[PDB]
Amino acid sequence: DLMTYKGEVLGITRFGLAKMKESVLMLASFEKTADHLFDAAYFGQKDSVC
Amino acid sequence: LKPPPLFPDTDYKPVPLKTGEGEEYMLALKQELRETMKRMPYFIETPEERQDIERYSKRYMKVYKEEWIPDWRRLPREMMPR
Amino acid sequence: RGRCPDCGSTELVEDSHYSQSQLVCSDCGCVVTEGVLTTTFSDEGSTGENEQVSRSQQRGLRRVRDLCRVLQLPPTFEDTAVAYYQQAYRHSGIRAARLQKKEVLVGCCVLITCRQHNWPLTMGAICTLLYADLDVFSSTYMQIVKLLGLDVPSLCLAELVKTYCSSF
Amino acid sequence: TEGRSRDGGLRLGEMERDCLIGYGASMLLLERLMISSDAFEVDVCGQCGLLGYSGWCHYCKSSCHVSSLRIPYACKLLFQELQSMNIIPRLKLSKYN
Amino acid sequence: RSVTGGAWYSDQDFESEFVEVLNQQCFKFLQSKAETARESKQNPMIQRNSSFASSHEVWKYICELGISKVELSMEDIETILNTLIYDGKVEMTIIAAKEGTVGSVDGHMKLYRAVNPIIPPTGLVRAPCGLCPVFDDCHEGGEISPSNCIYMTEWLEF
Amino acid sequence: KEQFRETDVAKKISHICFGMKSPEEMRQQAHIQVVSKNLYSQDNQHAPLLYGVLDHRMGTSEKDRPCETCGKNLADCLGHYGYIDLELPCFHVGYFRAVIGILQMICKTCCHIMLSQEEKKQFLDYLKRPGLTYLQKRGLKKKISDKCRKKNICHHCGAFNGTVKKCGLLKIIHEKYKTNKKVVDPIVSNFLQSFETAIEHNKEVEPLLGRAQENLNPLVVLNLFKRIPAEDVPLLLMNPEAGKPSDLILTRLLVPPLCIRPSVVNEDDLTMKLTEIIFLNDVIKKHRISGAKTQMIMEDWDFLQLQCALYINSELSGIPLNMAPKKWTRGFVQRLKGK
Amino acid sequence: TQAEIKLCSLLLQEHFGEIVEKIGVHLIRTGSQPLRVIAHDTGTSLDQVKKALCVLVQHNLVSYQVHKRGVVEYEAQCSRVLRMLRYPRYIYTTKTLYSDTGELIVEELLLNGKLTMSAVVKKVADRLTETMEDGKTMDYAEVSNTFVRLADTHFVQRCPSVPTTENSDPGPPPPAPTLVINEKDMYLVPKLSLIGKGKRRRSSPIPDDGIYWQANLDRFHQHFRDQAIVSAVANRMDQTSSEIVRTMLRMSEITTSSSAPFTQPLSSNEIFRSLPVGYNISKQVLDQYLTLLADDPLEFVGKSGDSGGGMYVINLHKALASLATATLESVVQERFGSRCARIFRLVLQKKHIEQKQVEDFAMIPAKEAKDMLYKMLSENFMSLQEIPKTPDHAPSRTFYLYTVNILSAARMLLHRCYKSIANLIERRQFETKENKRLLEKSQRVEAIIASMQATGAEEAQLQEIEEMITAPERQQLETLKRNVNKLDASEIQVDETIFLLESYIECTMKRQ
Ligand code: SF4
Ligand SMILES: [Zn+2]
Ligand SMILES: [Zn+2]
Ligand SMILES: [Zn+2]
Ligand SMILES: [Zn+2]
C-alpha cells in the first residue's frame, strides 16, 4: 500500500523519495545532498522538526 | 595591513546650491504645507486610549471630533465611515 | 578546579586509570576533583611565509645549496650554512661588494659550518671550485669572522689524517 | 576518538540506530546518541534566528532575545558549516510544552 | 613617428605642459573670435561664417605667438583642437580647399568654432550622495548611514 | 530593590528556515574584516597576524589562550566570523543554475517576465492555492518556464529577446543580435555601422562581426537583478522574505571560525585554500594600478571565479589542461559528501 | 524596486501618518486584493483598513474594480504614489502663468483629493476673503474665469462619473458603483446656482451634486518639456529661436499625441503670422532662420518638405535623447572629471573602439588612461563587445571593443538618485527626532512669549524667557534650520533631472 497511496506506483528510489517525502534533512542525508540544499535555500523552505 | 578608514577622502566636492527667490518661497511653502495639511482628517494618528481614571477634567477639556463625510455614492458597499 | 574542592591546590597534572584524561593536583593527592577531556587530532591526510628575496640573493642561495651537495653530506649542513648566509646578507658592504666576494662567501660559510661539526675538510678542496684565490678568500674569511665575532674550532691534527690516509 | 590504538571506545553505526527504532525505544536512543556521547549546549537569539554566545546576540546588538538549548555537537558544527556556503538555517523558537 | 613621438614626446617623457597650454590658449583665441564675430550682431546667417575660425588662421596665430620653441605643425595643431570637441567646447565646419595657404583637405578645407554647454551643472552633483563613493553601502541599517556618514554632514558645514 | 529577572525559559525548536544572506547582511553578521594574505609574523614566535587569517579575535585553535572576542578558552568558545570582499563580482556555482534560469525567464530590456495578464492571474491564483508543496512548486516552475520560453516578443517594453546559451563552464551568453536564421532585421545595419570605426582601424573584425552575441558577464547580470520589479519577484517561486534575487550573486565571503578548521600538524585545507583567494584578490588589486591591457584583466577575474568555484567543491569537470586542479581538495561539498 | 518603496513609504508616512502607510506599502507590494485577505496579511482590524483605503481612493493612489466571480479588489497606482514631490512645481507653474488665485485653487485641488466646482469655488472664495480686510470681497465671477481658463487649457478636468446606475441593472446592485469617464464633457464646466461672493465662516442645495474635478498633471509634464526645449534652443543660438519654437509648439499642442516622436509640420507662413507682433523679423529672415535651425546637426527640428511654405517638424524623441546624453555627460564630468567626459564622448561617437586606438585621441599617456577606462566598468556606464576571433573564444583571440547604451545608464542612475533623495529626507527626519527635546523646549518658550505678547504685556517676561541655555542653543536650532534649507533646496534641485530622465525613458517604450 505504501508504494501506491499517492495514486501512482512510487518505487524506493532517489526519485521516488523526492516525490514522497518533504522535509529537508532526510533528503540531504540520503543522496544528491548539495543539489537539495541549494534548491531548498533557493525556495526559502521552512522545515518542521517532525 | 591596516584596513582603510570607513570614509575615504574625495577629490571633488558637491556643487553649491543656486539661489532662486520663487524657489525659496516654494522652499518655505513646502515646510509650511507639510505641517499644514497634516490637520486634514485624511491624516490619521492613533485613536485616544488608555486613560488613568475618570476625572471631571476630561469632561471640561474634552476632545471634539465628528465622523468624516466621504462621497457615499462612489465607493463600494462597506464604505460607511462608522 | 585550581583548588581542590576548597583548599590550597593550584597546580594541574594528568593521570587516569583507563584510557582517560584527569587533571592530577597536588595539595590534595587529587585530580583537582575535576579532570577535563583532552581534545586531539589525526586520521586525515615548518612555516611558509617565504620571502620572495632579491633575485641575486637567491642566486647566491642556489650557489650555496649546489656547493655543499658536492660533499653529499647531511642536509643539516646545507640548512645551517643557508641560515648563516641569510645572517650575513644583512649588511651594506656585503650587498655592495663585487659578486666574487659573495662566491667566496658561499664557501667560507660551509667552511665554518663543517668546522662546527668538526667535519674534515681543507681550503684547497673548496677553492678548486669557486675560481678563488688565496688572498681573496682568506681576506674575505678574516673580514667575515671578525665582523660576526663567531667562535669556531681549529683543524685538529688527527681529524684530517683519518680521511687523508684513507685516500691512498 | 577512533579506536583501541587511540582510546576511542566503540562505534554504533546506522544499522543499530535502526534496531533501536525497531524496538521503538525512544529514551534509550536519545540517551545513547546525545546524552552519553557528545551532549553540548548552545545559545540562540529568537529575534533574528541566529546563533550567539555568552548570553548575547552580536547580530541584533541586544540581550533580551537570547536563550540556551541542548544540542548534539555535530549539529552545531553543521549549522556553523552551512553558513560559509551562504545557506542560512534560521531558527524559530517555541514553548517547550 | 612611432619612434619620435613628435614635438610633444620629449626625452621619452610626455610634455603635458606644452599640450595643455596649447589647448587652453587655442580655445582662448577661438572663443575670442566667436565672441567678436557675434558682436557684429547683424545676422545669424553671416555669423554662420564669421563665428568660425580657420585651422590655418589659428595655426598662424599660435605659431605667431611662438610659445613653443619647437615648431608647430598644421595637422599637429588641428588635432590639438580636435580634442576640444570631445572636451565639449567647440564645433566643426568644412568648406572648399581655397581657404588659407594649405587647403588641408582633398578639394576642401575645415573650420572650428566655440560652443555653449546646453545645461548648467545638475542638481544631483550638488548632493553628497551624488558624490558619496560608498553610496551603495551608505544604508540606514548599515554602519554607513545618513545618521553617521561623514561626507553626508560636512556637506552641511561648507 | 531589584527588578524581576526571567532566569530561563524551557524552549524547543519549532522550524528550520533555509534562506540566503545579502552582502549587507553579511557585513552586519561579521565581527572583523581580514585584509592580509600572510598569516604569521616573520619572527621566531610564529605569532598570528592581527588582520590576517587565523586572527585569534575570530576564535581559537589551541589549548593556551582564549579568543580576543569571547574571552574564554577553546573548551567553550563557540566561534566567530570574519569576512572578505572581492574586487569584481563572481558567480556562486551552487546557484549557477538559478542564475541561468532567471536570465532565461526575464525580458532583458525591461526586466519583466513575459507573461499575459491572463497568465498572471492563473499563476497568482495557483500561488493562492492552499497547501502548496515542494513538488507542486516544481510543477509550476516547469509549466511557467514552458509557457515563457516559447515567447519571443515582450508585451511590456515592445521588443523581442534572443535566447540564453552557455559559452563554456562558469560562463553564459545570450543570442540577441546574431545573424538570425529568420533573416536579420534592419537593425543589422545599425550593428554594422557600430563596427565601422573598428573595421576601419582593424579590418580583421569584419570576418567576425557577423558572429556577435550578447557578451553578458557577472557584473552586468548582477546589475540586471538589481532592477527586478518587486511584483515580479515571487513568481520565480522564491519567497521574497527568504532570499531576494540580488543575493544569488556574491561580492563578499565569510571566513568561518578557526574551530571549523583547526590548523595543526600546521596547515589546514580551508585555511590555505582561502589564502589563495585573498592572494589572487590582492594581485588583481595591484593590477588595478598597472596600465595593463584587457586580456590579463578579464583573465585574472576568471581566475578569481575559478578559485571560488574550487573553494566550494572539487570535482568540477570543464577546465582546460593548463590550469587544471593540482590535487584532491576537501571543499565544503566534499566534507558533506560520502560515507 | 526598493528605493521606490523607501521613498514612497516615508513620504506617505509624512503626509498621512504611520497608520495608513503600512496598508499603502503592502498594497504596492501586492497590487490588488479584497479587504479580507488584506486585513489577514496586515493583521489589522476592518475599520482601520477601511479608514485607510477610503483615503487612498479619495486621492486615487488606489483604484477599485469588480473582478471575476464579482470579487472587488483595489489596484495600486505605482506612479501616483510618488508624483507628490512634483506638486511644488505645479504650484510654481500656476502662479507663474496666473495670479495667486490659481495657486490657491490648485493647492486645494490636491489637498482634498477631489472637489465639485461649487465646493471648491466657495471654499477658495471664503479663504480669499480672509486675505483682505475692510469688507473687501472677490466675486465668484473672477474665480470662474480662472477656472474656465484652466479647464480650456486642460490643466484641470472632471473626474470619472458614476454610470446611469439609477436606471440600470434593476434588483440587487453591484458591490461598487464602478465609476466611468468620458472626454465629451471632460473640460465642460457646470452652470452653478450659487451666486455672489465668498462669506466669512462661523467655524461650527447642491446644484453640481457629484460633479467632481481634478488637476491634469500631464498637462504640466507636457509644458515642462516645452520649457526644456525652448530653453535649450535659447541657450544654443539665441532667444529668437526660442520664440519661433514656442510659436510652433503652442500651435502644435493639439496636432499630435502628447508622446508621439514627432509633430505634423506647420508652414513658415503660419509661423510668420503666429509670432508675436513684438518681434520685427521679416518673412525672408524668418525662413532663413528656420533653414539654419533645420540645418543644425543636433536636428531637434527638421524640414520634412516645403508644401504651403517651409515645412518644419519637431523631433521630440531625439531632443530627449540629446538632453539625456548631456545630463549623463555632466554627472560623469563632475563626479570624475572632464577627461572622463572626453573619453566618454570619443566612445559615444566611435561606437566600437579599443584602448590602443584612443590614447592618441585622448592624448593622455599610459598607466593612467587604461585604468581610467577600466574603473568606469565598475559603475556599468561602460560596456565591452569582446568579439572572439575563433570558436575557441580564448582571451588571446578576441577583440575588446568598448560600447555604450544610454538606456541602461538612465535606468541605473535612477537608483542612485532615488536613494540619495531618501537619504536627504531621512537625514532631516533623524536630525529633527534627535532634536525633539530642543524643538519642544523652543516651542514652549516661543508659546510663552506668544502669551502676554501684546495683550496684557509686561516687562518681567520679555527678557527672562530666552536667558537660559537657549542663548547658545537657539543658534543650534537656527543652524539646523539652515541645514534643512540646504537639503530642502537640493530636493527641488535634484528632481528636474529625474523629470527629464523619466520622460526620455517612457518615450523609449513601444508597449507592443
Ligand atoms: S548619507 Fe552618506 S552616502 Fe548618503 S549622501 Fe550623505 S554622505 Fe553620501
Ligand atoms: Zn587541604
Ligand atoms: Zn539576534
Ligand atoms: Zn570566542
Ligand atoms: Zn521587455
Side-chain angles (χ1 to χ4, degrees), chain A, chain B, chain C residues 1-31 33-168, chain D, chain E, chain F, chain G:
Chain A
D1 286 313
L2 178 57
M3 261 184 318
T4 185
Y5 88 97
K6 194 51 57 76
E8 169 79 8
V9 302
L10 281 304
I12 309 305
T13 69
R14 53 168 59 166
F15 319 104
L17 269 294
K19 294 175 191 292
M20 194 159 345
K21 298 270 193 169
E22 139 65 0
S23 287
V24 179
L25 294 178
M26 51 44 57
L27 326 159
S29 74
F30 182 61
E31 297 190 13
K32 310 201 300 177
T33 302
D35 293 358
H36 282 317
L37 271 193
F38 290 123
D39 311 0
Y42 174 53
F43 289 122
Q45 268 304 139
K46 59 168 62 176
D47 189 10
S48 49
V49 182
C50 59
Chain B
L1 194 166
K2 146 43 50 180
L6 216 30
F7 302 111
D9 65 331
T10 179
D11 53 345
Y12 300 107
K13 53 153 281 293
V15 173
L17 87 181
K18 58 174 178 179
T19 55
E21 314 317 312
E23 299 68 28
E24 288 163 44
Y25 141 80
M26 183 34 256
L27 175 160
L29 164 154
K30 204 52 151 173
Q31 60 79 7
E32 287 176 27
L33 80 89
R34 62 170 159 78
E35 301 317 314
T36 326
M37 56 40 62
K38 69 201 292 168
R39 64 82 191 171
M40 147 46 59
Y42 302 168
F43 172 92
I44 303 293
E45 70 276 60
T46 182
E48 301 76 320
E49 253 303 348
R50 175 31 180 141
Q51 201 258 309
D52 51 294
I53 295 97
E54 93 295 340
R55 60 176 78 201
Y56 294 178
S57 286
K58 307 310 182 182
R59 300 287 289 181
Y60 309 134
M61 51 41 62
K62 64 181 177 180
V63 65
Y64 180 80
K65 66 183 190 179
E66 60 190 37
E67 189 57 88
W68 180 243
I69 50 159
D71 183 358
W72 289 19
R73 304 292 72 192
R74 274 183 162 70
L75 322 183
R77 148 53 287 160
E78 79 303 324
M79 81 85 77
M80 82 76 68
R82 184 60 284 151
Chain C
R1 195 175 200 210
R3 302 290 87 143
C4 63
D6 53 356
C7 58
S9 147
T10 184
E11 58 269 76
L12 74 174
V13 165
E14 165 58 34
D15 196 17
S16 39
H17 322 126
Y18 303 108
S19 290
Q20 89 273 31
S21 165
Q22 314 195 240
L23 276 312
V24 167
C25 77
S26 313
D27 90 320
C28 299
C30 169
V31 161
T33 56
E34 61 102 29
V36 306
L37 284 53
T38 299
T39 179
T40 195
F41 96 115
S42 80
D43 304 331
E44 87 302 316
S46 63
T47 68
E49 305 296 59
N50 303 297
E51 171 45 38
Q52 57 79 66
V53 178
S54 171
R55 299 199 297 150
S56 64
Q57 184 182 354
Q58 53 84 0
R59 176 73 278 189
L61 280 293
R62 288 183 281 151
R63 288 310 311 156
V64 184
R65 151 212 73 250
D66 294 345
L67 199 186
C68 55
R69 293 185 314 118
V70 177
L71 331 172
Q72 69 188 41
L73 88 162
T76 53
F77 294 68
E78 212 222 343
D79 158 6
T80 183
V82 163
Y84 274 11
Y85 179 104
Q86 324 323 98
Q87 181 180 4
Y89 211 100
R90 306 189 299 152
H91 313 90
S92 55
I94 287 174
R95 291 187 294 260
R98 307 314 188 259
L99 72 88
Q100 60 90 349
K101 190 162 287 177
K102 301 190 173 87
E103 182 162 2
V104 300
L105 212 64
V106 303
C108 69
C109 61
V110 152
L111 180 62
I112 298 314
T113 298
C114 260
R115 202 76 62 71
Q116 303 313 359
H117 269 187
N118 68 19
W119 191 295
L121 80 181
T122 189
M123 321 315 88
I126 317 143
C127 301
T128 299
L129 197 154
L130 298 176
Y131 310 138
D133 158 38
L134 178 61
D135 185 346
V136 179
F137 73 77
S138 65
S139 59
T140 306
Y141 141 70
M142 161 304 299
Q143 184 182 10
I144 165 175
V145 174
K146 302 307 186 291
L147 173 64
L148 300 180
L150 304 177
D151 257 18
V152 55
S154 192
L155 296 309
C156 314
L157 275 61
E159 171 196 337
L160 282 61
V161 314
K162 274 292 301 303
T163 198
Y164 154 99
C165 68
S166 304
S167 303
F168 249 106
Chain D
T1 53
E2 227 64 44
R4 194 211 200 300
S5 59
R6 68 200 102 194
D7 267 29
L10 274 290
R11 147 143 191 199
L12 182 79
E14 291 46 50
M15 321 336 283
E16 271 96 330
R17 184 221 71 170
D18 172 58
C19 292
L20 279 316
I21 289 163
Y23 286 87
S26 68
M27 292 295 338
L28 181 43
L29 191 63
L30 173 142
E31 171 185 310
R32 184 50 58 203
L33 276 287
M34 162 265 298
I35 309 322
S36 56
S37 147
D38 51 280
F40 183 60
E41 152 276 320
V42 66
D43 309 319
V44 296
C45 171
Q47 192 283 330
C48 59
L50 281 299
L51 291 63
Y53 54 72
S54 311
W56 167 257
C57 177
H58 180 65
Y59 193 50
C60 303
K61 294 232 181 283
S62 181
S63 307
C64 61
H65 298 300
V66 285
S67 292
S68 55
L69 281 53
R70 304 281 300 310
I71 204 162
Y73 174 110
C75 184
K76 174 281 202 182
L77 175 59
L78 184 73
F79 296 156
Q80 292 174 311
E81 210 154 30
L82 285 322
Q83 285 188 2
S84 293
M85 317 163 29
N86 155 31
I87 292 160
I88 298 104
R90 265 170 284 248
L91 278 61
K92 287 183 178 181
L93 261 293
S94 72
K95 312 298 182 173
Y96 70 116
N97 57 274
Chain E
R1 194 205 60 68
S2 67
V3 185
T4 63
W8 52 95
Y9 198 61
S10 180
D11 297 345
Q12 292 60 61
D13 292 339
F14 177 55
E15 301 289 15
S16 57
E17 304 194 353
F18 307 170
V19 300
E20 81 189 348
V21 76
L22 284 169
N23 289 329
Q24 74 93 336
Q25 291 292 3
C26 293
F27 192 60
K28 177 58 175 72
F29 177 78
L30 180 62
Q31 63 94 359
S32 304
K33 190 187 183 71
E35 78 183 357
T36 53
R38 288 193 73 164
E39 281 293 355
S40 182
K41 70 176 60 72
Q42 300 310 296
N43 183 345
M45 271 75 78
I46 79 161
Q47 294 303 330
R48 196 73 185 286
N49 184 49
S50 185
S51 194
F52 271 83
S54 163
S55 71
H56 184 67
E57 168 185 23
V58 306
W59 170 84
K60 270 302 311 291
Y61 180 81
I62 196 71
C63 74
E64 174 61 23
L65 289 186
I67 307 102
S68 64
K69 308 303 85 175
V70 66
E71 178 61 311
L72 301 177
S73 302
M74 291 334 306
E75 75 305 318
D76 185 11
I77 293 302
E78 284 184 7
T79 52
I80 280 285
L81 294 323
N82 194 58
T83 69
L84 281 287
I85 40 163
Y86 303 112
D87 218 21
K89 298 310 304 181
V90 298
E91 183 173 44
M92 163 58 68
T93 284
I94 302 97
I95 57 161
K98 298 184 180 181
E99 162 47 32
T101 306
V102 181
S104 67
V105 184
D106 180 18
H108 298 295
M109 187 28 175
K110 61 193 167 87
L111 312 177
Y112 214 80
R113 181 259 282 276
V115 172
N116 297 346
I118 201 66
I119 54 173
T122 81
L124 179 64
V125 315
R126 308 185 151 83
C129 269
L131 280 295
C132 179
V134 298
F135 97 83
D136 58 334
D137 220 20
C138 188
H139 262 296
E140 81 286 40
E143 69 151 336
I144 317 86
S145 162
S147 57
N148 300 78
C149 187
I150 284 291
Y151 333 121
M152 150 65 98
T153 300
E154 187 276 343
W155 161 249
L156 309 182
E157 306 309 324
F158 164 100
Chain F
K1 54 212 161 303
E2 169 59 322
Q3 164 55 45
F4 158 70
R5 279 274 66 79
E6 281 305 359
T7 54
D8 59 291
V9 186
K11 285 288 187 69
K12 184 174 288 172
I13 270 176
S14 268
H15 332 117
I16 307 307
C17 187
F18 298 101
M20 309 195 247
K21 195 180 295 302
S22 88
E24 306 74 18
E25 291 256 350
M26 262 185 208
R27 184 73 146 283
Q28 183 168 348
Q29 216 295 318
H31 260 286
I32 89 177
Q33 74 284 70
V34 56
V35 55
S36 182
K37 55 213 161 302
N38 290 79
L39 64 150
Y40 300 123
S41 182
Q42 210 66 17
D43 68 49
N44 71 284
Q45 213 70 10
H46 298 63
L49 294 186
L50 155 53
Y51 283 130
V53 185
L54 299 62
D55 177 7
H56 294 171
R57 214 150 303 81
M58 200 155 58
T60 185
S61 184
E62 63 292 298
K63 84 172 271 203
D64 75 339
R65 27 196 163 181
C67 75
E68 285 64 34
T69 292
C70 89
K72 324 173 281 193
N73 80 303
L74 161 45
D76 74 354
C77 177
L78 278 281
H80 318 291
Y81 298 88
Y83 83 98
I84 55 174
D85 58 335
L86 294 80
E87 172 58 13
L88 282 183
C90 298
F91 302 137
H92 194 56
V93 185
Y95 290 131
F96 179 37
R97 264 271 281 161
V99 198
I100 50 136
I102 296 311
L103 320 153
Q104 193 153 300
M105 262 188 193
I106 298 174
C107 179
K108 314 310 176 282
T109 65
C110 69
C111 318
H112 288 62
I113 327 163
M114 302 66 68
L115 281 56
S116 169
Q117 303 274 0
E118 307 316 318
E119 293 165 336
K120 294 186 179 185
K121 192 272 180 181
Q122 182 180 8
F123 298 114
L124 261 63
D125 180 273
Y126 269 88
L127 271 283
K128 194 43 42 193
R129 206 73 52 65
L132 71 173
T133 71
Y134 180 98
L135 320 90
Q136 289 157 9
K137 264 161 280 192
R138 284 310 280 171
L140 320 153
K141 169 58 187 289
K142 134 183 61 183
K143 192 168 186 173
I144 76 179
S145 77
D146 300 335
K147 260 175 162 61
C148 295
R149 71 184 64 253
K150 75 189 190 80
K151 306 298 292 283
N152 36 41
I153 67 131
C154 166
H155 299 343
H156 192 36
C157 66
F160 85 112
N161 292 260
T163 56
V164 301
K165 294 277 73 174
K166 313 62 60 184
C167 35
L169 171 152
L170 262 173
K171 295 181 293 292
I172 166 63
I173 212 168
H174 171 260
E175 329 325 331
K176 165 33 51 172
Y177 41 74
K178 66 193 195 305
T179 187
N180 291 306
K181 297 196 302 181
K182 69 119 183 176
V183 189
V184 281
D185 296 325
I187 65 173
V188 71
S189 65
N190 305 109
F191 312 159
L192 288 161
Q193 192 278 325
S194 304
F195 313 133
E196 170 66 2
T197 300
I199 297 158
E200 281 296 313
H201 290 187
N202 184 41
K203 289 76 170 178
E204 296 93 304
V205 308
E206 195 282 337
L208 312 180
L209 63 84
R211 204 172 63 109
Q213 298 289 15
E214 219 155 356
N215 56 257
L216 43 56
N217 68 51
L219 191 73
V220 47
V221 178
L222 202 179
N223 230 57
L224 155 54
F225 296 180
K226 298 307 302 291
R227 149 188 313 96
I228 310 311
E231 142 197 294
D232 292 17
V233 173
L235 318 88
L236 291 308
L237 315 82
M238 318 186 16
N239 164 13
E241 284 63 73
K244 51 189 293 279
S246 147
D247 304 355
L248 303 177
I249 278 154
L250 60 61
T251 63
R252 292 201 263 254
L253 279 314
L254 266 56
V255 290
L258 322 173
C259 293
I260 277 289
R261 52 189 173 86
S263 303
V264 75
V265 177
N266 291 287
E267 57 265 41
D268 196 11
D269 190 331
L270 290 177
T271 301
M272 70 170 167
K273 173 61 200 77
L274 187 180
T275 293
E276 327 285 350
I277 273 288
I278 178 149
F279 180 92
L280 186 59
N281 227 238
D282 273 298
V283 152
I284 203 167
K285 175 269 300 187
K286 174 59 185 71
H287 216 68
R288 313 322 296 123
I289 277 304
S290 70
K293 317 306 194 294
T294 57
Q295 303 80 359
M296 52 312 301
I297 278 306
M298 176 133 173
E299 288 164 12
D300 200 2
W301 186 14
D302 175 36
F303 309 164
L304 291 183
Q305 164 166 180
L306 183 32
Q307 282 283 359
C308 292
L310 275 306
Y311 174 65
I312 293 293
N313 96 76
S314 311
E315 61 156 339
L316 316 82
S317 55
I319 319 87
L321 82 176
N322 62 298
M323 73 278 280
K326 306 304 180 294
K327 205 193 151 303
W328 180 68
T329 290
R330 195 172 62 173
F332 278 97
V333 165
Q334 263 304 350
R335 40 194 286 162
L336 285 320
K337 188 71 75 185
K339 294 173 179 68
Chain G
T1 55
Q2 276 66 25
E4 301 93 313
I5 288 144
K6 200 71 166 70
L7 286 170
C8 75
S9 60
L10 72 84
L11 292 173
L12 227 48
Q13 181 274 339
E14 172 76 328
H15 281 261
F16 303 96
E18 72 211 337
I19 165 62
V20 306
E21 96 296 16
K22 61 207 70 181
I23 312 304
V25 175
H26 186 64
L27 162 66
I28 166 62
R29 174 201 310 310
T30 278
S32 65
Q33 272 315 268
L35 179 149
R36 287 271 63 86
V37 70
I38 292 165
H40 272 317
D41 269 28
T42 51
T44 294
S45 62
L46 165 63
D47 58 344
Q48 295 290 1
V49 181
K50 290 201 308 180
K51 73 173 62 186
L53 82 91
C54 60
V55 171
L56 300 323
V57 176
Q58 177 60 315
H59 292 265
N60 71 263
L61 319 90
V62 75
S63 147
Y64 72 80
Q65 178 61 297
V66 180
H67 301 281
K68 191 60 59 178
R69 274 41 200 181
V71 307
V72 174
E73 306 191 357
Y74 304 71
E75 303 69 34
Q77 305 307 309
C78 198
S79 57
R80 182 65 16 197
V81 285
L82 52 76
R83 299 318 312 131
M84 150 171 248
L85 83 175
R86 191 57 54 68
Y87 294 0
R89 193 174 174 167
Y90 306 146
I91 268 67
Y92 205 131
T93 326
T94 181
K95 73 163 183 173
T96 299
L97 273 56
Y98 313 120
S99 190
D100 165 273
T101 52
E103 165 293 345
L104 264 59
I105 284 163
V106 297
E107 62 180 27
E108 291 271 35
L109 241 194
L110 307 73
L111 181 149
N112 326 72
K114 304 184 185 68
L115 319 89
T116 82
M117 319 328 314
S118 179
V120 48
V121 303
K122 187 181 182 293
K123 283 169 180 284
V124 79
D126 321 299
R127 186 165 69 273
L128 283 164
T129 63
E130 262 80 67
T131 72
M132 70 303 287
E133 312 89 345
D134 156 78
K136 182 65 180 181
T137 52
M138 262 285 93
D139 308 357
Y140 303 154
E142 47 267 32
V143 178
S144 302
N145 298 345
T146 71
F147 163 44
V148 301
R149 182 175 69 227
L150 290 163
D152 154 77
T153 58
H154 311 328
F155 283 88
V156 71
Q157 63 193 31
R158 202 183 295 209
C159 70
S161 182
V162 292
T164 57
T165 187
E166 79 293 346
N167 192 38
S168 59
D169 196 13
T178 61
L179 316 184
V180 294
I181 188 70
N182 195 308
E183 60 79 28
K184 69 189 174 67
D185 50 31
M186 141 65 87
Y187 310 108
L188 177 62
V189 306
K191 176 54 59 174
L192 306 183
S193 301
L194 287 303
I195 64 173
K197 294 160 179 295
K199 183 165 63 179
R200 297 177 179 89
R201 191 186 172 211
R202 72 179 191 179
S203 200
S204 67
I206 306 301
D208 59 318
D209 186 15
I211 310 305
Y212 288 85
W213 285 61
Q214 185 51 264
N216 186 28
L217 77 174
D218 60 40
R219 189 62 167 134
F220 298 84
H221 305 174
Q222 182 197 30
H223 169 301
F224 298 163
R225 55 166 170 82
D226 305 340
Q227 284 176 333
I229 65 157
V230 300
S231 304
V233 300
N235 317 147
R236 184 49 56 84
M237 173 309 276
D238 178 59
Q239 66 87 357
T240 50
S241 67
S242 86
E243 185 55 36
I244 76 188
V245 174
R246 181 163 46 239
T247 298
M248 151 294 300
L249 75 87
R250 72 175 165 250
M251 323 144 80
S252 302
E253 301 189 40
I254 61 174
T255 72
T256 191
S257 176
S258 304
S259 305
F262 39 64
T263 194
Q264 76 82 33
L266 320 89
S267 176
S268 70
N269 293 2
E270 289 86 73
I271 308 307
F272 182 60
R273 309 320 303 130
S274 188
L275 63 83
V277 56
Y279 285 73
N280 70 72
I281 191 168
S282 62
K283 179 49 159 57
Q284 73 281 14
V285 176
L286 174 134
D287 284 330
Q288 288 159 10
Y289 278 31
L290 291 163
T291 303
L292 292 184
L293 271 293
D295 195 40
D296 182 350
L298 279 69
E299 67 172 341
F300 27 76
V301 160
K303 189 75 194 293
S304 80
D306 214 62
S307 52
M311 273 312 73
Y312 294 90
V313 170
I314 177 76
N315 305 318
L316 318 89
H317 58 286
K318 271 188 292 285
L320 327 164
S322 306
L323 294 323
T325 48
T327 179
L328 182 164
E329 291 163 57
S330 77
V331 60
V332 301
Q333 166 277 301
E334 190 57 28
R335 187 63 170 70
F336 313 99
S338 58
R339 58 192 173 266
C340 314
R342 292 181 173 200
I343 317 143
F344 183 14
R345 283 186 280 237
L346 311 163
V347 285
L348 203 30
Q349 293 184 2
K350 312 309 177 182
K351 298 178 185 178
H352 289 90
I353 197 158
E354 296 204 323
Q355 65 186 217
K356 73 170 188 274
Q357 295 154 353
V358 294
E359 289 178 311
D360 50 349
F361 295 94
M363 67 48 57
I364 298 301
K367 175 72 212 93
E368 56 180 311
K370 293 178 175 76
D371 90 347
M372 181 65 147
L373 267 298
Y374 299 154
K375 63 169 178 70
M376 271 326 168
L377 282 294
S378 70
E379 312 86 346
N380 285 252
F381 321 151
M382 211 45 67
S383 182
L384 196 77
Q385 223 73 54
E386 70 86 30
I387 187 76
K389 309 181 196 186
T390 60
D392 309 336
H393 303 70
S396 59
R397 49 194 65 190
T398 181
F399 296 110
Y400 298 83
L401 297 159
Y402 289 108
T403 297
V404 202
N405 178 287
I406 300 155
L407 303 314
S408 76
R411 289 175 184 286
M412 162 295 298
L413 157 55
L414 280 199
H415 322 307
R416 184 174 292 177
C417 305
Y418 286 25
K419 191 185 179 189
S420 299
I421 292 157
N423 292 358
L424 327 172
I425 304 313
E426 159 285 350
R427 176 81 196 183
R428 227 165 50 60
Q429 303 328 108
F430 147 65
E431 291 172 339
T432 52
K433 284 321 320 174
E434 66 87 355
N435 280 283
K436 77 191 300 288
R437 294 141 271 190
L438 287 62
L439 294 169
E440 178 270 304
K441 181 58 58 171
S442 57
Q443 189 278 344
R444 175 182 176 89
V445 298
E446 291 302 321
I448 294 163
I449 287 297
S451 306
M452 61 66 58
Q453 190 172 18
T455 81
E458 66 189 327
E459 70 283 357
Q461 188 158 311
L462 301 179
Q463 291 94 69
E464 298 77 6
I465 301 303
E466 69 272 70
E467 190 172 49
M468 71 305 298
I469 199 43
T470 199
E473 183 298 342
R474 276 177 177 277
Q475 301 82 354
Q476 183 274 0
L477 288 178
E478 288 300 303
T479 299
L480 167 68
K481 201 182 303 296
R482 272 71 190 159
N483 302 343
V484 167
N485 302 343
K486 172 172 277 180
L487 78 96
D488 203 8
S490 45
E491 331 159 332
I492 78 164
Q493 304 181 29
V494 70
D495 43 358
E496 40 285 47
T497 70
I498 298 284
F499 161 67
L500 272 311
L501 188 161
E502 324 326 320
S503 302
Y504 155 99
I505 203 73
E506 80 66 10
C507 79
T508 301
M509 331 326 299
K510 284 311 320 183
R511 314 201 91 241
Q512 76 205 330

